[PDB]
Design an enzyme around this catalytic site. Sequence first.
Site, mmCIF file in Angstrom:
data_model
loop_
_atom_site.group_PDB
_atom_site.id
_atom_site.type_symbol
_atom_site.label_atom_id
_atom_site.label_comp_id
_atom_site.label_asym_id
_atom_site.label_seq_id
_atom_site.Cartn_x
_atom_site.Cartn_y
_atom_site.Cartn_z
ATOM 1 N N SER A 12 0.812 -1.225 0.000
ATOM 2 C CA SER A 12 0.000 0.000 0.000
ATOM 3 C C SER A 12 0.851 1.283 0.000
ATOM 4 O O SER A 12 1.527 1.588 -0.979
ATOM 5 C CB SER A 12 -0.970 -0.009 1.182
ATOM 6 O OG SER A 12 -2.003 0.942 1.020
ATOM 7 N N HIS B 84 -7.868 -5.798 0.025
ATOM 8 C CA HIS B 84 -6.682 -4.969 0.177
ATOM 9 C C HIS B 84 -5.672 -5.634 1.112
ATOM 10 O O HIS B 84 -4.469 -5.662 0.828
ATOM 11 C CB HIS B 84 -7.046 -3.581 0.687
ATOM 12 C CG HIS B 84 -5.914 -2.604 0.620
ATOM 13 N ND1 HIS B 84 -5.243 -2.321 -0.551
ATOM 14 C CD2 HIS B 84 -5.344 -1.830 1.574
ATOM 15 C CE1 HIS B 84 -4.302 -1.424 -0.312
ATOM 16 N NE2 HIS B 84 -4.343 -1.109 0.969
#
Lengths: 255, 256
Positions: free
Chosen positions: B79, B234
Amino acid sequence: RKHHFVLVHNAYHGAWIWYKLKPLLESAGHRVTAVELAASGIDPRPIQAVETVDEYSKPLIETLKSLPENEEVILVGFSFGGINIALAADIFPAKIKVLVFLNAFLPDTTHVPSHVLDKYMEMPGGLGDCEFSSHETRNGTMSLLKMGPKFMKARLYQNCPIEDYELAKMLHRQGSFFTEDLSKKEKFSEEGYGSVQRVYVMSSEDKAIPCDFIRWMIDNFNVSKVYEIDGGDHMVMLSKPQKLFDSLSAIATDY
Amino acid sequence: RKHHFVLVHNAYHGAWIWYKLKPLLESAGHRVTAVELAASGIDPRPIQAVETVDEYSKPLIETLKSLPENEEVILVGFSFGGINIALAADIFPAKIKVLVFLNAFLPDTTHVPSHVLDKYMEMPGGLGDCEFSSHETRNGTMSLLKMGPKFMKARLYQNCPIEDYELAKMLHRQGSFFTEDLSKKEKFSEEGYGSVQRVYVMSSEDKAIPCDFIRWMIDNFNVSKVYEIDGGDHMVMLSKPQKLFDSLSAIATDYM
Protein backbone atom coordinates in the site's frame (compact mmCIF):
# COMPACT_ATOMS: atom_id res chain seq x y z
CA ARG A 1 -29.50 -14.57 28.53
CA LYS A 2 -26.55 -12.47 27.35
CA HIS A 3 -23.94 -10.69 29.44
CA HIS A 4 -21.27 -8.01 29.17
CA PHE A 5 -17.79 -9.50 29.31
CA VAL A 6 -14.91 -7.24 30.23
CA LEU A 7 -11.65 -8.83 29.14
CA VAL A 8 -8.39 -7.82 30.79
CA HIS A 9 -5.13 -8.98 29.20
CA ASN A 10 -1.83 -9.92 30.82
CA ALA A 11 1.41 -7.95 31.21
CA TYR A 12 3.72 -7.58 28.18
CA HIS A 13 0.64 -8.00 26.01
CA GLY A 14 -2.42 -6.01 25.07
CA ALA A 15 -6.08 -6.14 24.10
CA TRP A 16 -5.06 -7.80 20.84
CA ILE A 17 -4.82 -11.21 22.56
CA TRP A 18 -8.61 -11.38 22.62
CA TYR A 19 -9.04 -11.16 18.84
CA LYS A 20 -10.24 -14.74 18.54
CA LEU A 21 -12.40 -14.80 21.65
CA LYS A 22 -14.13 -11.44 21.18
CA PRO A 23 -16.06 -12.42 18.00
CA LEU A 24 -16.97 -15.83 19.48
CA LEU A 25 -18.57 -14.13 22.49
CA GLU A 26 -20.19 -11.35 20.46
CA SER A 27 -21.46 -13.86 17.91
CA ALA A 28 -23.30 -15.61 20.76
CA GLY A 29 -24.89 -12.26 21.59
CA HIS A 30 -22.72 -11.15 24.50
CA ARG A 31 -21.31 -7.63 24.71
CA VAL A 32 -17.50 -7.56 24.89
CA THR A 33 -15.07 -4.90 26.09
CA ALA A 34 -11.36 -5.67 25.69
CA VAL A 35 -9.58 -3.17 27.91
CA GLU A 36 -6.14 -1.88 26.92
CA LEU A 37 -4.20 -1.15 30.12
CA ALA A 38 -1.44 1.50 30.32
CA ALA A 39 1.88 0.99 28.51
CA SER A 40 0.19 -2.03 26.95
CA GLY A 41 -0.33 -2.89 23.30
CA ILE A 42 -0.74 0.27 21.24
CA ASP A 43 -1.05 2.46 24.36
CA PRO A 44 1.24 5.46 23.64
CA ARG A 45 2.87 5.37 27.11
CA PRO A 46 6.21 3.71 27.77
CA ILE A 47 6.23 1.39 30.79
CA GLN A 48 8.69 3.85 32.36
CA ALA A 49 5.82 6.34 32.34
CA VAL A 50 3.62 4.00 34.40
CA GLU A 51 5.08 3.83 37.91
CA THR A 52 2.24 2.28 39.93
CA VAL A 53 -0.10 -0.66 39.41
CA ASP A 54 -2.96 1.80 39.96
CA GLU A 55 -1.91 3.82 36.88
CA TYR A 56 -1.50 0.55 34.97
CA SER A 57 -5.11 -0.48 35.73
CA LYS A 58 -6.59 3.01 35.32
CA PRO A 59 -8.17 2.19 31.91
CA LEU A 60 -9.95 -0.80 33.53
CA ILE A 61 -11.21 1.26 36.47
CA GLU A 62 -12.22 3.94 33.97
CA THR A 63 -14.20 1.37 31.95
CA LEU A 64 -16.17 0.26 35.02
CA LYS A 65 -16.53 3.84 36.24
CA SER A 66 -18.37 4.88 33.08
CA LEU A 67 -20.48 1.71 32.95
CA PRO A 68 -24.26 2.25 32.62
CA GLU A 69 -25.46 2.27 36.26
CA ASN A 70 -27.07 -0.92 37.53
CA GLU A 71 -25.12 -2.83 34.86
CA GLU A 72 -23.01 -5.77 36.07
CA VAL A 73 -20.22 -7.48 34.16
CA ILE A 74 -18.28 -10.70 33.93
CA LEU A 75 -14.76 -9.44 34.60
CA VAL A 76 -12.11 -11.70 33.06
CA GLY A 77 -8.53 -11.33 34.26
CA PHE A 78 -5.81 -13.18 32.38
CA SER A 79 -2.50 -13.90 34.16
CA PHE A 80 -1.31 -10.67 35.80
CA GLY A 81 -4.77 -9.44 34.82
CA GLY A 82 -5.84 -11.31 37.93
CA ILE A 83 -4.27 -8.64 40.11
CA ASN A 84 -5.92 -5.99 37.94
CA ILE A 85 -9.41 -7.40 38.40
CA ALA A 86 -8.92 -7.87 42.15
CA LEU A 87 -7.91 -4.18 42.21
CA ALA A 88 -11.05 -3.23 40.27
CA ALA A 89 -13.34 -5.46 42.38
CA ASP A 90 -12.16 -3.65 45.50
CA ILE A 91 -13.38 -0.35 44.00
CA PHE A 92 -16.54 -1.36 42.11
CA PRO A 93 -17.58 -4.74 43.63
CA ALA A 94 -21.26 -4.17 42.72
CA LYS A 95 -20.52 -3.61 39.02
CA ILE A 96 -19.14 -7.14 38.90
CA LYS A 97 -21.32 -10.22 39.10
CA VAL A 98 -18.42 -12.66 38.72
CA LEU A 99 -14.62 -12.43 38.57
CA VAL A 100 -13.04 -14.90 36.16
CA PHE A 101 -9.41 -15.75 36.90
CA LEU A 102 -8.03 -17.20 33.67
CA ASN A 103 -4.60 -18.73 34.26
CA ALA A 104 -4.36 -15.69 36.51
CA PHE A 105 -2.64 -14.76 39.75
CA LEU A 106 -5.32 -15.06 42.40
CA PRO A 107 -4.50 -12.62 45.21
CA ASP A 108 -5.89 -13.19 48.69
CA THR A 109 -7.29 -10.88 51.32
CA THR A 110 -4.76 -11.72 54.01
CA HIS A 111 -1.23 -10.94 52.77
CA VAL A 112 0.23 -7.93 50.96
CA PRO A 113 -1.13 -7.62 47.40
CA SER A 114 2.22 -8.75 45.93
CA HIS A 115 2.17 -11.99 47.96
CA VAL A 116 1.31 -14.55 45.26
CA LEU A 117 3.61 -12.70 42.85
CA ASP A 118 6.53 -12.97 45.29
CA LYS A 119 5.85 -16.62 46.08
CA TYR A 120 5.79 -17.09 42.29
CA MET A 121 9.13 -15.38 41.65
CA GLU A 122 10.68 -17.59 44.36
CA MET A 123 10.05 -20.73 42.29
CA PRO A 124 13.17 -22.41 40.85
CA GLY A 125 13.91 -22.20 37.13
CA GLY A 126 14.36 -18.59 36.15
CA LEU A 127 12.71 -17.18 33.03
CA GLY A 128 14.62 -18.26 29.92
CA ASP A 129 15.80 -15.37 27.76
CA CYS A 130 13.56 -12.75 29.39
CA GLU A 131 15.31 -9.45 30.04
CA PHE A 132 15.24 -8.00 33.54
CA SER A 133 15.71 -4.27 34.03
CA SER A 134 15.18 -1.62 36.71
CA HIS A 135 13.79 1.89 36.70
CA GLU A 136 14.03 4.58 39.37
CA THR A 137 10.73 6.23 40.25
CA ARG A 138 9.30 8.79 42.66
CA ASN A 139 8.81 5.85 45.04
CA GLY A 140 11.93 3.70 44.72
CA THR A 141 12.88 1.34 41.93
CA MET A 142 10.40 -0.43 39.68
CA SER A 143 11.34 -3.82 38.25
CA LEU A 144 10.79 -4.17 34.51
CA LEU A 145 10.79 -7.22 32.26
CA LYS A 146 10.67 -7.99 28.58
CA MET A 147 10.07 -11.55 27.40
CA GLY A 148 12.46 -13.43 25.19
CA PRO A 149 11.33 -15.31 22.07
CA LYS A 150 12.52 -18.72 23.30
CA PHE A 151 10.81 -18.27 26.65
CA MET A 152 7.56 -17.21 24.94
CA LYS A 153 7.58 -20.12 22.50
CA ALA A 154 8.40 -22.73 25.12
CA ARG A 155 6.32 -21.55 28.08
CA LEU A 156 3.50 -19.34 26.76
CA TYR A 157 2.73 -20.36 23.17
CA GLN A 158 3.61 -24.09 23.04
CA ASN A 159 0.14 -25.05 21.79
CA CYS A 160 -0.56 -21.97 19.68
CA PRO A 161 -0.64 -21.84 15.90
CA ILE A 162 2.77 -20.60 14.72
CA GLU A 163 1.08 -17.47 13.33
CA ASP A 164 0.08 -16.45 16.85
CA TYR A 165 3.58 -16.85 18.22
CA GLU A 166 4.83 -14.75 15.30
CA LEU A 167 2.10 -12.18 15.93
CA ALA A 168 3.13 -11.99 19.59
CA LYS A 169 6.78 -11.46 18.68
CA MET A 170 5.54 -8.45 16.66
CA LEU A 171 3.45 -7.00 19.51
CA HIS A 172 4.75 -7.93 22.95
CA ARG A 173 6.23 -5.04 24.91
CA GLN A 174 8.35 -4.53 27.99
CA GLY A 175 6.18 -4.40 31.08
CA SER A 176 6.11 -4.92 34.82
CA PHE A 177 4.53 -6.90 37.66
CA PHE A 178 4.70 -3.86 39.95
CA THR A 179 5.91 -6.19 42.70
CA GLU A 180 7.43 -3.21 44.52
CA ASP A 181 4.36 -0.96 44.32
CA LEU A 182 2.15 -3.89 45.29
CA SER A 183 4.23 -4.80 48.35
CA LYS A 184 3.61 -1.32 49.78
CA LYS A 185 -0.09 -1.51 49.05
CA GLU A 186 -3.01 -2.03 51.44
CA LYS A 187 -4.20 -5.65 51.30
CA PHE A 188 -7.37 -6.39 49.32
CA SER A 189 -10.48 -5.96 51.46
CA GLU A 190 -13.05 -8.63 52.22
CA GLU A 191 -15.86 -6.06 51.95
CA GLY A 192 -14.85 -5.25 48.38
CA TYR A 193 -12.79 -7.78 46.44
CA GLY A 194 -13.70 -10.56 48.86
CA SER A 195 -17.47 -10.12 48.48
CA VAL A 196 -17.46 -10.54 44.68
CA GLN A 197 -18.14 -14.00 43.21
CA ARG A 198 -15.04 -15.60 41.67
CA VAL A 199 -14.24 -18.68 39.63
CA TYR A 200 -11.03 -20.06 38.18
CA VAL A 201 -10.30 -21.21 34.63
CA MET A 202 -7.06 -23.09 34.03
CA SER A 203 -5.36 -24.61 31.03
CA SER A 204 -4.22 -28.18 31.57
CA GLU A 205 -0.86 -27.46 29.89
CA ASP A 206 0.07 -24.05 31.33
CA LYS A 207 3.87 -23.88 31.36
CA ALA A 208 4.07 -20.27 32.57
CA ILE A 209 2.15 -20.70 35.81
CA PRO A 210 2.51 -24.32 37.01
CA CYS A 211 -0.65 -26.30 37.79
CA ASP A 212 0.58 -26.78 41.35
CA PHE A 213 1.23 -23.11 41.94
CA ILE A 214 -2.27 -22.47 40.61
CA ARG A 215 -3.61 -25.00 43.09
CA TRP A 216 -1.64 -23.44 45.94
CA MET A 217 -3.25 -20.11 45.05
CA ILE A 218 -6.79 -21.51 44.94
CA ASP A 219 -6.04 -23.47 48.10
CA ASN A 220 -4.77 -20.22 49.62
CA PHE A 221 -7.98 -18.41 48.59
CA ASN A 222 -11.04 -20.42 47.50
CA VAL A 223 -13.24 -19.96 44.41
CA SER A 224 -16.82 -21.08 43.62
CA LYS A 225 -15.78 -23.26 40.66
CA VAL A 226 -12.63 -24.32 38.84
CA TYR A 227 -13.01 -24.91 35.11
CA GLU A 228 -10.26 -26.68 33.20
CA ILE A 229 -9.46 -26.31 29.52
CA ASP A 230 -7.96 -29.50 28.14
CA GLY A 231 -4.83 -28.91 26.07
CA GLY A 232 -4.59 -25.17 26.58
CA ASP A 233 -1.26 -23.48 27.08
CA HIS A 234 -0.88 -20.22 28.99
CA MET A 235 -2.27 -18.27 26.02
CA VAL A 236 -5.49 -20.32 25.99
CA MET A 237 -7.43 -17.58 24.19
CA LEU A 238 -5.12 -18.15 21.21
CA SER A 239 -4.58 -21.92 21.43
CA LYS A 240 -8.07 -23.01 22.56
CA PRO A 241 -10.34 -20.01 21.78
CA GLN A 242 -13.46 -22.13 21.32
CA LYS A 243 -12.97 -24.09 24.55
CA LEU A 244 -12.30 -20.82 26.33
CA PHE A 245 -15.64 -19.65 24.92
CA ASP A 246 -17.32 -22.81 26.18
CA SER A 247 -15.91 -22.19 29.69
CA LEU A 248 -17.03 -18.56 29.83
CA SER A 249 -20.38 -19.59 28.38
CA ALA A 250 -20.76 -22.13 31.22
CA ILE A 251 -19.73 -19.43 33.70
CA ALA A 252 -22.34 -17.02 32.30
CA THR A 253 -25.01 -19.67 32.71
CA ASP A 254 -24.02 -20.57 36.28
CA TYR A 255 -24.01 -16.87 37.28
CA ARG B 1 17.18 -20.85 -3.87
CA LYS B 2 16.14 -19.11 -0.65
CA HIS B 3 16.00 -15.33 -0.33
CA HIS B 4 15.73 -12.62 2.29
CA PHE B 5 12.34 -10.95 2.18
CA VAL B 6 11.97 -7.52 3.72
CA LEU B 7 8.29 -6.81 4.38
CA VAL B 8 7.08 -3.23 4.70
CA HIS B 9 3.56 -2.63 6.02
CA ASN B 10 1.09 0.10 5.12
CA ALA B 11 0.11 3.29 6.96
CA TYR B 12 -2.17 3.06 10.02
CA HIS B 13 -0.86 -0.48 10.49
CA GLY B 14 2.34 -2.13 11.65
CA ALA B 15 4.59 -5.16 11.27
CA TRP B 16 1.85 -7.30 12.84
CA ILE B 17 0.03 -7.55 9.49
CA TRP B 18 2.64 -10.06 8.34
CA TYR B 19 2.00 -12.60 11.09
CA LYS B 20 0.47 -15.13 8.71
CA LEU B 21 2.89 -14.61 5.83
CA LYS B 22 6.13 -14.52 7.82
CA PRO B 23 5.95 -18.18 8.98
CA LEU B 24 4.87 -19.36 5.51
CA LEU B 25 7.96 -17.76 3.97
CA GLU B 26 10.30 -18.85 6.77
CA SER B 27 8.88 -22.37 6.68
CA ALA B 28 9.92 -22.53 3.02
CA GLY B 29 13.42 -21.54 4.10
CA HIS B 30 13.45 -17.86 3.26
CA ARG B 31 14.61 -15.34 5.84
CA VAL B 32 12.06 -12.66 6.70
CA THR B 33 12.36 -9.17 8.16
CA ALA B 34 9.11 -7.39 8.93
CA VAL B 35 10.05 -3.76 9.51
CA GLU B 36 8.14 -1.54 11.90
CA LEU B 37 8.15 2.00 10.56
CA ALA B 38 7.92 5.06 12.84
CA ALA B 39 4.69 5.84 14.73
CA SER B 40 3.53 2.45 13.46
CA GLY B 41 2.30 -0.54 15.45
CA ILE B 42 4.00 -0.69 18.83
CA ASP B 43 6.53 2.02 17.87
CA PRO B 44 6.58 4.36 20.91
CA ARG B 45 6.36 7.54 18.78
CA PRO B 46 3.11 9.39 18.15
CA ILE B 47 2.48 10.27 14.50
CA GLN B 48 2.74 13.91 15.57
CA ALA B 49 6.39 13.17 16.40
CA VAL B 50 7.07 11.99 12.83
CA GLU B 51 6.93 15.05 10.57
CA THR B 52 8.59 13.79 7.37
CA VAL B 53 8.23 10.67 5.24
CA ASP B 54 12.00 10.24 5.64
CA GLU B 55 11.62 9.89 9.42
CA TYR B 56 8.71 7.51 8.85
CA SER B 57 10.85 5.21 6.67
CA LYS B 58 14.00 5.54 8.79
CA PRO B 59 13.63 2.02 10.30
CA LEU B 60 13.46 0.59 6.77
CA ILE B 61 16.54 2.51 5.58
CA GLU B 62 18.24 1.48 8.83
CA THR B 63 17.44 -2.20 8.14
CA LEU B 64 19.04 -2.06 4.67
CA LYS B 65 21.90 0.07 5.95
CA SER B 66 22.96 -2.63 8.41
CA LEU B 67 22.42 -5.47 5.93
CA PRO B 68 25.35 -7.90 5.51
CA GLU B 69 27.52 -6.74 2.64
CA ASN B 70 26.80 -8.02 -0.85
CA GLU B 71 23.43 -9.27 0.42
CA GLU B 72 20.39 -8.45 -1.75
CA VAL B 73 16.76 -8.58 -0.69
CA ILE B 74 13.27 -8.90 -2.06
CA LEU B 75 11.74 -5.67 -0.80
CA VAL B 76 7.95 -5.91 -0.40
CA GLY B 77 5.99 -2.68 -0.07
CA PHE B 78 2.32 -2.91 0.87
CA SER B 79 0.00 0.00 0.00
CA PHE B 80 1.68 3.21 1.20
CA GLY B 81 4.66 0.92 1.75
CA GLY B 82 5.14 1.32 -1.99
CA ILE B 83 6.35 4.89 -1.44
CA ASN B 84 8.58 3.63 1.37
CA ILE B 85 10.31 1.05 -0.81
CA ALA B 86 10.75 3.52 -3.68
CA LEU B 87 12.39 5.83 -1.12
CA ALA B 88 14.67 2.99 0.04
CA ALA B 89 15.49 1.85 -3.51
CA ASP B 90 16.71 5.36 -4.30
CA ILE B 91 19.24 5.10 -1.47
CA PHE B 92 20.32 1.45 -1.60
CA PRO B 93 19.37 0.23 -5.12
CA ALA B 94 22.10 -2.45 -5.08
CA LYS B 95 20.86 -4.07 -1.86
CA ILE B 96 17.57 -4.80 -3.63
CA LYS B 97 17.19 -7.63 -6.17
CA VAL B 98 13.50 -6.87 -6.79
CA LEU B 99 10.89 -4.41 -5.53
CA VAL B 100 7.49 -5.99 -4.93
CA PHE B 101 4.56 -3.58 -5.04
CA LEU B 102 1.72 -5.31 -3.22
CA ASN B 103 -1.55 -3.43 -3.69
CA ALA B 104 0.89 -0.53 -3.36
CA PHE B 105 1.17 3.00 -4.63
CA LEU B 106 3.69 2.82 -7.46
CA PRO B 107 5.43 6.18 -7.73
CA ASP B 108 7.08 7.21 -10.99
CA THR B 109 10.32 8.97 -11.80
CA THR B 110 8.75 11.91 -13.61
CA HIS B 111 6.35 13.75 -11.27
CA VAL B 112 6.71 14.88 -7.65
CA PRO B 113 6.85 11.91 -5.24
CA SER B 114 3.32 12.66 -3.98
CA HIS B 115 1.87 12.49 -7.52
CA VAL B 116 0.07 9.11 -7.43
CA LEU B 117 -1.09 9.89 -3.89
CA ASP B 118 -2.65 13.18 -5.01
CA LYS B 119 -4.23 11.61 -8.09
CA TYR B 120 -5.60 9.02 -5.67
CA MET B 121 -7.10 11.52 -3.22
CA GLU B 122 -8.82 13.25 -6.16
CA MET B 123 -10.94 10.21 -6.85
CA PRO B 124 -14.64 10.15 -5.90
CA GLY B 125 -15.77 7.91 -3.06
CA GLY B 126 -14.44 9.81 -0.07
CA LEU B 127 -13.28 7.64 2.84
CA GLY B 128 -16.24 6.46 4.93
CA ASP B 129 -15.89 7.13 8.66
CA CYS B 130 -12.16 7.88 8.52
CA GLU B 131 -11.13 10.87 10.62
CA PHE B 132 -9.15 13.66 8.99
CA SER B 133 -6.94 15.89 11.12
CA SER B 134 -4.10 18.37 10.70
CA HIS B 135 -0.88 19.04 12.56
CA GLU B 136 1.43 22.05 12.38
CA THR B 137 5.10 21.20 11.90
CA ARG B 138 8.44 22.91 11.41
CA ASN B 139 7.62 22.81 7.69
CA GLY B 140 3.92 23.65 7.39
CA THR B 141 0.93 21.47 8.18
CA MET B 142 0.92 17.69 8.02
CA SER B 143 -2.32 15.92 7.17
CA LEU B 144 -3.22 13.06 9.51
CA LEU B 145 -5.80 10.30 9.19
CA LYS B 146 -7.29 7.60 11.35
CA MET B 147 -9.45 4.91 9.79
CA GLY B 148 -13.00 4.24 10.88
CA PRO B 149 -14.28 0.71 11.61
CA LYS B 150 -16.95 0.78 8.89
CA PHE B 151 -14.46 1.96 6.28
CA MET B 152 -11.96 -0.74 7.30
CA LYS B 153 -14.55 -3.52 7.26
CA ALA B 154 -16.04 -2.54 3.91
CA ARG B 155 -12.95 -1.49 1.94
CA LEU B 156 -9.90 -3.15 3.53
CA TYR B 157 -11.03 -6.33 5.27
CA GLN B 158 -14.08 -7.50 3.27
CA ASN B 159 -12.54 -10.93 2.61
CA CYS B 160 -10.69 -11.36 5.91
CA PRO B 161 -11.66 -13.71 8.72
CA ILE B 162 -13.65 -11.70 11.29
CA GLU B 163 -10.86 -12.29 13.83
CA ASP B 164 -8.47 -10.29 11.64
CA TYR B 165 -10.84 -7.35 11.32
CA GLU B 166 -11.26 -7.43 15.12
CA LEU B 167 -7.46 -7.67 15.56
CA ALA B 168 -7.02 -4.65 13.29
CA LYS B 169 -9.57 -2.64 15.29
CA MET B 170 -7.36 -3.36 18.32
CA LEU B 171 -4.11 -2.30 16.60
CA HIS B 172 -4.64 0.28 13.85
CA ARG B 173 -3.30 3.75 14.69
CA GLN B 174 -3.60 7.26 13.34
CA GLY B 175 -1.07 7.84 10.59
CA SER B 176 -0.25 9.92 7.54
CA PHE B 177 0.44 9.80 3.80
CA PHE B 178 2.91 12.67 4.12
CA THR B 179 1.35 14.15 0.98
CA GLU B 180 2.68 17.58 1.96
CA ASP B 181 6.25 16.46 2.69
CA LEU B 182 6.24 14.36 -0.47
CA SER B 183 5.09 17.22 -2.70
CA LYS B 184 8.15 19.23 -1.67
CA LYS B 185 10.47 16.32 -2.29
CA GLU B 186 12.92 15.70 -5.13
CA LYS B 187 11.44 13.26 -7.64
CA PHE B 188 12.65 9.64 -7.55
CA SER B 189 15.78 9.16 -9.64
CA GLU B 190 16.14 6.80 -12.58
CA GLU B 191 19.70 5.96 -11.50
CA GLY B 192 18.45 4.74 -8.12
CA TYR B 193 14.81 3.75 -7.80
CA GLY B 194 14.41 3.46 -11.56
CA SER B 195 17.27 0.96 -12.02
CA VAL B 196 15.87 -1.57 -9.51
CA GLN B 197 13.78 -4.51 -10.73
CA ARG B 198 10.07 -4.14 -9.90
CA VAL B 199 6.95 -6.27 -10.16
CA TYR B 200 3.36 -5.72 -9.10
CA VAL B 201 1.08 -7.98 -7.08
CA MET B 202 -2.60 -7.07 -6.96
CA SER B 203 -5.67 -8.52 -5.28
CA SER B 204 -8.60 -9.03 -7.63
CA GLU B 205 -11.02 -7.60 -5.05
CA ASP B 206 -9.10 -4.60 -3.68
CA LYS B 207 -11.71 -2.06 -2.56
CA ALA B 208 -9.22 0.43 -1.10
CA ILE B 209 -7.17 1.00 -4.25
CA PRO B 210 -9.37 0.43 -7.34
CA CYS B 211 -8.13 -2.00 -10.00
CA ASP B 212 -8.30 0.80 -12.56
CA PHE B 213 -6.25 3.21 -10.48
CA ILE B 214 -3.74 0.40 -10.03
CA ARG B 215 -3.67 -0.03 -13.82
CA TRP B 216 -3.24 3.70 -14.38
CA MET B 217 -0.24 3.59 -12.05
CA ILE B 218 1.38 0.62 -13.79
CA ASP B 219 0.52 2.20 -17.13
CA ASN B 220 2.11 5.41 -15.81
CA PHE B 221 5.25 3.48 -14.79
CA ASN B 222 5.86 -0.05 -16.10
CA VAL B 223 6.81 -3.20 -14.17
CA SER B 224 8.43 -6.49 -15.26
CA LYS B 225 5.46 -8.63 -14.20
CA VAL B 226 1.99 -8.21 -12.75
CA TYR B 227 0.79 -11.04 -10.50
CA GLU B 228 -2.86 -11.23 -9.49
CA ILE B 229 -4.25 -12.86 -6.37
CA ASP B 230 -7.76 -14.16 -6.99
CA GLY B 231 -10.22 -13.18 -4.26
CA GLY B 232 -7.84 -11.04 -2.21
CA ASP B 233 -9.03 -7.85 -0.60
CA HIS B 234 -6.68 -4.97 0.18
CA MET B 235 -5.32 -6.86 3.19
CA VAL B 236 -4.30 -9.85 1.06
CA MET B 237 -1.68 -11.05 3.58
CA LEU B 238 -4.58 -11.65 6.00
CA SER B 239 -7.30 -12.84 3.60
CA LYS B 240 -5.17 -14.87 1.16
CA PRO B 241 -1.85 -15.46 2.99
CA GLN B 242 -1.10 -18.71 1.14
CA LYS B 243 -1.76 -17.26 -2.32
CA LEU B 244 0.36 -14.26 -1.34
CA PHE B 245 3.07 -16.78 -0.48
CA ASP B 246 2.63 -18.47 -3.85
CA SER B 247 3.02 -15.10 -5.63
CA LEU B 248 6.18 -14.13 -3.73
CA SER B 249 7.49 -17.65 -4.24
CA ALA B 250 6.97 -17.25 -8.00
CA ILE B 251 8.68 -13.84 -7.82
CA ALA B 252 11.68 -15.32 -5.97
CA THR B 253 12.00 -17.96 -8.68
CA ASP B 254 11.77 -15.47 -11.56
CA TYR B 255 14.38 -13.21 -9.92
CA MET B 256 16.77 -15.93 -8.83
